[PDB]
Design a binder for these strands. Structure first.
Ligand SMILES: Nc1nc(=O)[nH]cc1C(=O)O
Length: 196
DNA sequence: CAGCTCTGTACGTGAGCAGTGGACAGCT
DNA sequence: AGCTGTCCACTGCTCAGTACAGAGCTG
């Protein structure tokens, strides 16, 4: 239990997406966790490396945490959303129907606000997104920039390893910070190419 | 065969938890 | 000195997606 709050109570709770227009980066999660639903703020968890990697990459340029998430769209042009709106404990707890339902809702949100870069935050959520939305399932899928824009917009797709600490292949935030940096370079490159 | 999909299985760090015990001040 | 308590340093845990092998497909 979290400070006396049952897990069943957290499952009923939802984590509201923080979204505006003209955003440089929208961070797409898998689906909000217990700690995330509890705090009412994105990427609380003690481990998750999100806020650590955000600082180490120089994106935030100051060390922040989940409570500053609402100030991100204004200052840093960074938004938040999820593949699945439902509050879930882990990824293995999600079915295929839920992912694809969330896939439709996600792409509709993405083609609504239309940011510069739509950043997936996992391996798996883009695998399903690419198969569902683009109808393209590629063997040996890779991280980083993707060949396909979301339909009828200019928004690029960028894939990163999940900021969750459950991932053994990327044990430390030092391992995942590499993609955050390249994301920053992509953002600066889109701004410079636009002003040209 | 060859390739593709599906299921299950195993894998590292470092933050936080409860339990443990040593340090140690306040007593008499 | 002897006893008893709090406090905290420290312990041993457990816990927050991804790659891949192999069974079961289909061409
Ligand atoms: N973006 C996320 N949000 C969550 O609530 N859990 C996990 C992720 C993730 O793996 O990116």
């Amino acid at each position: 239990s979290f400070n006396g709050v049952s897990e069943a109570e957290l499952l009923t709770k939802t984590l509201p997406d923080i979204l505006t227009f003209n955003l440089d980066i929208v961070i797409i999660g898998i689906a909000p966790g217990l700690m995330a639903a509890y705090k009412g703020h994105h990427y609380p968890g003690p481990g998750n490396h999100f806020w650590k990697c955000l600082f180490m990459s120089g994106l935030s340029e100051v060390q922040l945490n989940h409570m500053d998430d609402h100030t991100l769209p204004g200052k840093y042009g960074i938004g938040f959303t999820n593949m699945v709106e439902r509050t879930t404990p882990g990824s293995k707890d999600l079915s295929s129907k839920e992912f694809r339902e969330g896939g439709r809702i996600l792409v509709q949100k993405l083609q609504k606000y239309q940011p510069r870069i739509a950043v997936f935050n996992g391996k798996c959520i883009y695998e399903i997104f690419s198969k569902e939305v683009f109808g393209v399932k590629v063997k040996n899928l890779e991280f980083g920039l993707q060949p396909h824009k979301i339909p009828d917009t200019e928004t690029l797709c960028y894939v990163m390893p999940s900021s969750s600490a459950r991932c053994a292949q990327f044990p430390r935030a030092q391992d995942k910070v590499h993609y955050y940096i390249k994301l920053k370079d992509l953002r600066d490159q889109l701004k410079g190419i636009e002003r040209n």
